[PDB]
Paper text:
As the virus buds from the cell, the viral protease cleaves [name] into several fragments, including the capsid protein (CA) that then assembles into the mature capsid shell (core), rendering the virus particle infectious. The CA portion of all retroviral [name] proteins folds into two separate domains, the N-terminal domain (CANTD) and C-terminal domain (CACTD). In mature lattices, CANTD interactions form only intra-hexamer and intra-pentamer interfaces, while CACTD interactions are also involved in formation of inter-hexamer and inter-pentamer interfaces.
Further analysis of the different hexamers forming the mature CA lattice in polyhedral CLPs revealed that despite the deformability of the CA hexamer, local symmetries exist in the lattice. Aside from the C2-symmetric hexamers that are also observed in regular tubes (and are surrounded by only hexamers, Fig. 3b group V), a fraction of hexamers in the polyhedrons were surrounded by either two or three pentamers in a symmetrical manner and hence followed C2 symmetry and C3 symmetry, respectively. This observation was further confirmed via the structure determination of a small set of T = 3 icosahedral particles solved by single-particle cryo-EM. The similarity of the C3 hexamer from the T = 3 icosahedra (formed by CA) to the C3 hexamer from the polyhedrons (formed by CASPNC and [name]) suggests that the structural deviation from C6 symmetry is not due to the presence of either the [name] molecule, nor the absence of the β-hairpin, nor the SPNC region.
Numbering used by the authors:
A (entry chain A): 154 to 229
B (entry chain C), C (entry chain B), D (entry chain B): 11 to 148, 152 to 229
Write the structure that this text describes.
Amino acid sequence: ADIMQGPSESFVDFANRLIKAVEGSDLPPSARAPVIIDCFRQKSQPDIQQLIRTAPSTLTTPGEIIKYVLDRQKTA
Amino acid sequence: WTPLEPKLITRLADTVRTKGLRSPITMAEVEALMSSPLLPHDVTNLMRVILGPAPYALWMDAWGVQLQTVIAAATRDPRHPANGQGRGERTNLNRLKGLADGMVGNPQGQAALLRPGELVAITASALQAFREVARLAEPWADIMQGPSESFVDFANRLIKAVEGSDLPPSARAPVIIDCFRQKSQPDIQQLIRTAPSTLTTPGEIIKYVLDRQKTA
Amino acid sequence: WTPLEPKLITRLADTVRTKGLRSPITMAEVEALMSSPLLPHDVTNLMRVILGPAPYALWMDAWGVQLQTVIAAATRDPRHPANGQGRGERTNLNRLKGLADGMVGNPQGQAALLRPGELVAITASALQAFREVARLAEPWADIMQGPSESFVDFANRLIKAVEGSDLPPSARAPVIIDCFRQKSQPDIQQLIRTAPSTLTTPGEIIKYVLDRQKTA
Amino acid sequence: WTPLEPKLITRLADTVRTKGLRSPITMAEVEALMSSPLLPHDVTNLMRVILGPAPYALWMDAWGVQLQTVIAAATRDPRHPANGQGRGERTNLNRLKGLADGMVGNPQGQAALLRPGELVAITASALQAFREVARLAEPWADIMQGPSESFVDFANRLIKAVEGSDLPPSARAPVIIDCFRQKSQPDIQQLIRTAPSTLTTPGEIIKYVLDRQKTA
């Protein structure tokens, strides 16, 4: 719950770090995917936050969110 | 047909006006006025009076969607308390929304032709739609205990934001505990860390912290 | 005949005095006190007490016009619940307005000679007349979303002004949509413009905007 | 095959250059040079010459889309004047866009294999695509009658912007009327308001206002 995407960090590194810390924690197995999704939505600095918010489709899996963000990310 | 008291409706409208749509007291009051099975006329006028124009539009949409899900389940099971055994008792959405023949604008005829199963299904649908619109109209991982904030205020805010969120019901307690441990500025963090007993419930953590907190 | 409580009438009069004629709470209260079929005496005295002099004149006019439309429909169909089968039961406006023989000023005789269909027709006519006068007493193309206003308030105001206007019923939804798109200050304008799906209903636009709105 | 005169094409290009794409004189000139059924080569070169690069790209897109709609209607009806009775005469988009075998770059062979129905369908498609691109390249609820502007100019501008917009066809007349009533600065507003007759058509409103307008 203390993991933020740094201003200069890429998104795949942030996703790796977050999934690592969530799966290697004390949560039940059935609570990891919703937590990872809701942490993608609230962390992951406001450009990607708005990118996920304005998703014409409903993303219901961390893999789908990662794919969508990697497709439509701001190349920089 | 007997109408609901305008006094109760006025009190409920003022409750919605002061407390909002999402307060637990407001939902309790709505559950109270949603006790007896209401006719489509009753629920429609009730939501017209207690809700503003835009929430009323949202609620009409949500009520239609929930009634459509109900009718899909009804065509998926001929034993619906709204349905009958033969095909001539199948319930159309015109009969649920009060749009069928002999019902449009007339609550007496409505009460005549409607089934009790129809009434309870309409009522449950309207309640779920109200819940959806209330959750829609007006972030737990961003909540920190301020440097000057007390611990009971922080716990109240955190439990509110966690229970009023999109998490499953079985994932709220572990999240509340792990947010008590990682938020709640490092004095209380160390106070929880050095707990000779194992705290496995938000209430127990709150009690322990309130006992051993630094009076200041 | 049993009169309405002066306590309820006093509360309704104060409601009309503070909230106005057009508030949804006021219309709900009027619908409440318009539950049982009232005799012309009851509705006339009720409007005399709750309405001021000029709104009362307007309401008398509108009630007469609506009752005349009802009597035209009645002479257009001999199966009116106010009419009878033979020509001797045809209902004249003197019997509807309470001006017929044996009714002028006497509520007991009124309740004696009147039909239940007559009562419900009079009541519906009076309700529609009240709605007309309320819409008349105290512009949709001039509505803009203020810089600080939320979107649900703007949608409520716009839908209210569009539905309570002179447009045909089949032209309200396209106008509401095209006003959502061109009003609703450029942040929401761009939010609606860049919609990967096609939004073809005010409810769908409202849901989409409420989902993807900039929390602030 | 006979080519179009480069003199007419030069005059049309200068017309498009000075008047623009959307002027009624330009559309009339295009309709003039779109009189005889043209081969894909002719229309393609014509749009290459009269349109700039970006409008030409837009026009290629729109022409393709309209031709695809035509081919969908053609597979939805075997009696298309471009089709034949058997399946061997079905018209592919390569034959419409001039991309089929024996046609690529050769206008003589094009004119040989093409049908007159094919030619007229291609021509109508190209005209509709030109209209779309012209409407796209260079807001009706923002139109006001200026303090010094005459009423026929305001009516022309308003009807243009309303008919060339995203409204359904059945919603243009009520919108034009209600915009005449609320725009069109308060002298004409009061002139329309105090109309002893009920005006239920934009033409009737225009005639009435032109009759009773304040000569100045």
